[PDB]
């Protein structure tokens, strides 16, 4: 459950990614694939070599979905139902994997937005990503 403060912290912080969405999304995915090799088994058909264009494109998709999540922070289950069907109904992604990606997204944001990544903002971003994770791993339809 996000507080009104968590909501404004996420919008201000994530709004900084701006046109770096694809770069940041790709980097978070790269960090996850390298640090937690097991997460690769979910993308067996992907070219997972560093600099891979497939990963670059996918990173953009992930970043954009987050941007949409931030925009519909008050009705995420509704706004993310399509992704919930994909990750929970079809892919059956183990919840631990979302925690690994969320951690890598935080690391990416901390590496690129040092001024934005305050303790409180870091706290709101974590809760936000945890919420997004819960929705994508839940079958509520």
């Amino acid at each position: 459950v996000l507080s009104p403060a968590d909501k404004t912290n996420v919008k201000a912080a994530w709004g900084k990614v701006g046109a770096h969405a694809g770069e940041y999304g790709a980097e978070a995915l790269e960090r996850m694939f390298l640090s937690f090799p097991t997460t690769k088994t979910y993308f067996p058909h992907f070219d997972l070599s560093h600099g891979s264009a497939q990963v670059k494109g996918h990173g953009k998709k992930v970043a954009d979905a987050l941007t949409n999540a931030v925009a519909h922070v008050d009705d995420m289950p509704n706004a993310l139902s399509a992704l919930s069907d994909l990750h929970a109904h079809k892919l059956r992604v183990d919840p631990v994997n979302f925690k690994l990606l969320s951690h890598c997204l935080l690391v990416t944001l901390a590496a690129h937005l040092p001024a934005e990544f305050t303790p409180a903002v870091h706290a709101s971003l974590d809760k936000f990503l945890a919420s997004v994770s819960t929705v994508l791993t839940s079958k509520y339809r």
Partner: protein, 146 residues
Amino acid sequence: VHLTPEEKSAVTALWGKVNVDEVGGEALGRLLVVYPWTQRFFESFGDLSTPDAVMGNPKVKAHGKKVLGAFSDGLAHLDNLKGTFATLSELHCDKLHVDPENFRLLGNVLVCVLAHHFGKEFTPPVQAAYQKVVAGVANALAHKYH
């Protein structure tokens, strides 16, 4: 923990630049802020009411410094983390009863702090190496649980 010699160099190089007076307090501080329930273990530490209070707290900074020191000793005995952390494990497991998941969280918060401090220098490859270190450190601290 298995670190390629190339990963060892990258790790050591980065760690050698770590501000030992601040990094530790910042990781412990962010832990108390991001996962509030951990605060319940540091009731003697005084004011933890707000984030700024937590981060600027002298006792938190001093304690974080010890935590940082613990990670430094682990980096100097990767081939023997269980033995090195045998005493700390008994303390955190048999006495404090800290849930193992919390050891993992602090390890990752430390990773976030390194990212915050080194920005561009904390590359994905460097992170990967550090993730193996913190996992090894967390596992050792939790061995008295196993």
